[model samples]
Target chain A: ATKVVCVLKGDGPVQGIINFEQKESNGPVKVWGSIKGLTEGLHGFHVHEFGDNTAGCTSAGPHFNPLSRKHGGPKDEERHVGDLGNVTADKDGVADVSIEDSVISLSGDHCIIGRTLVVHEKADDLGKGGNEESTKTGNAGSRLACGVIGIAQ
Target chain B: ATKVVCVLKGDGPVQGIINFEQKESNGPVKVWGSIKGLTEGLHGFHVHEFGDNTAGCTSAGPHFNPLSRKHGGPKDEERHVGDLGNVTADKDGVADVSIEDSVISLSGDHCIIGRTLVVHEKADDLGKGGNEESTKTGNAGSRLACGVIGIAQ
Candidate 1:
């Protein structure tokens, strides 16, 4: 089969967080995961293009935009390849998230093959029903935390 | 050890809106963990009593209120025992969150044992920061999504 679920653990606050996981899957490589142990409040999260989890999240590279497309909605008529949008936390500061990126692969020619998950201090606006910056990540700012996404091998 | 974590996954267009976690080094045994998923854009989240993970997320129980405490804040002079709080999502509909409960657990004798995370369809003002019905949960309305907190054991 070409389908497997990637589960993981999250430990940190909106101010500091990171996680990583990989698994074999069928059809498209889908990822089902969540972040644990965080401050019960609002925070920003996204999928980056690099695995520099060592950079303390600074090395996660840019948004997973392989086609060099603008940062648009996931289903936007014209969106970037690495644009697998956002997630939300409950009053308890815990968020469960999932994504099926045709861009990420193990046999090569994938989008997030070696990318990472980056949590921000704010939201990603998604460049839509809001501000000017929303067109490029809702003007969300600050790199709170990050983790690398690799093959479960 | 008397602490546990809960999380939810972010899907397309629904990226990092909010992420969180908590440290229950000093709380009850029934640790409450919850997560709220976002839609369109704005939304609210909290820790309900039941654990529901249905299609639209409606399996979680009621608000975590085994003590019948008034609805209030963590720092509030008074509030409900089930009142965990609220969470907000970014433009991308993603939110990373976390928390530490005074009454809920995933292990030990005082563990929540069997619970679930929940998501709402409205916005929680986190209260007016003063006197008002909205003072505790900010008058957030509706239950959008829900997840049950299960013991890893």
Candidate 2:
């Protein structure tokens, strides 16, 4: 009935919010948001498997791979649903984006609310880094920030 | 090294941000925030057991109680560390809360980060409702909005 939101936070002053909106039960989810305080480059963005942040992002587990797919870019046919590619920040340390995703949803048999959204320290190779870590984590590097998705009231 | 922030979202446009600040490793956490679009009154506020929103707030599970204590208010001797009590909204449906809690820490032996912060639809009886449910949930009714706490950059 409403849009879903994920707020990003890290050990620095990095902060931002991501919005997810779907019009139909099986329609593509429209994702958008703005993040600030970065290193003026691309950062890996994905829906992590677990939201357990008790040990911080390290305990967030792995990427959300319910379908048990290999890591790939958002558009790759073999991509994980959590794979949304990357978010680019400007020299001013801000990144604003709008993307339409087919795999993730807000309602239906499954939803993204309660999962963790992680921003990585480096660019996500998008499973093309040509290594074992690339197929599993895109060699996304360390987590910079993460927050859970929730329904906006 | 940085602060923690939690952004609350619900079915409506209800929104807000809660910040967690701790000056030392084992010191009390300074919690503060402002939430908008809530009904005018006292609404139960708490840290939930899980940040799993795979199925929406229902999957967020129960109140955080690693101490395995009975439900109680923020100041009760027998209470969950998640009990930060309530946030009261005004006629404009906005609630601003500032609480200092010693039971929770940012970088201690345990922490609240990665857990879900939930705002309830009713006033929390704080385990004084004189019923079994009271001892478990403080009789706090339906979840209104919730989010996970994460370290912010």
Candidate 3:
């Protein structure tokens, strides 16, 4: 019950598969996946509020902040559960991503299934930038792609 | 790519597994599931707008009406993509139900993956009633059990 998967979909031909895996209830979730058709560099990755992509990624809503915490890095103690930080895309325009997150869970109170996983065009500043949108979005620009986190076997 | 699954969860000991499977992109989606701890009788089943479920089923929003159609039975000519009608529970408080719906697809215009599947407290009248909320919700009562539909292999 702790394994969930997400299929990334975007306006163009962006494609990816994100999977969250856990060994126990309170263990760290292994966020591992691969993506194609992305720029080479770091891209901000976060879980948005809803999986209601009816209006496409626009309706996926804001960053998922159940605790109302400020946006920060995945390793930050007081960061939002949506703050999984960034993934590095290689030179071939592919992001072979891997991250171990402690806040987001596949089960229990903070289970993130059915939410939206978003890939942003810019790297997250981890709430460190001087801009106004930094704390709210980590200054991650334009949502390049997004997908709903779904239940997996 | 045409199959999805959902795990029903409520306040109490409600337990269920709902699976949606489709053979082709533009074909009918087979909505099949088994539920326990529901009252004996009919319960309205429909896909709510979002998979948020953050405020429980309340944040799941209204029926998913991509076409902005009125609520009707599964067999109605024009109906909401979420309108899959009702399922009957057995005497043991279990609803081993199944339905094949054409409007709700798995990989196309109205693909319902990551949406919320709600079980209403009462039977849906299929938009035929004297009440004010018939055409919108088929007179289905309060939400009982609900689950978020997730992508499946």
Best by DockQ: 3
**A92 in model 3: Cα distance from truth in Å?**
0.4
- What is the TM-score of each predicted model, taking all chains together? 0.40, 0.56, 0.55
Which whole-number lDDT from 0 to 100 does residue B142 have in model 3?
Answer: 81
- Tens digits of per-residue lDDT for model 2 on A62-95? 8888789899999999998789999999999999
Kindly indicate the candidate among 1 and 3 with the higher lDDT. Answer: 3
Model 2 captures what fraction of native contacts?
0.01
Candidate 1 wrong stretches, greater than 4 Å: A1-26, A39-43, A100-107, A129-132, B1-153
Q: Could you arrange the candidates by DockQ from highest to lowest?
A: 3, 2, 1
Candidate 1 chain B worst ten-residue window by lDDT: B12-21
Ranking by TM-score: 2, 3, 1
The ten-residue window of minimal lDDT in model 1 chain A covers A1-10
For every prediction, compared with the true complex, DockQ reads 0.01, 0.06, 0.10
lDDT of 1: 0.47
Q: Of the candidates shown, which would achieve the greatest TM-score relative to the real structure?
A: 2
Q: For residue A140, give model 2's deviation from the true position in Å.
A: 1.3
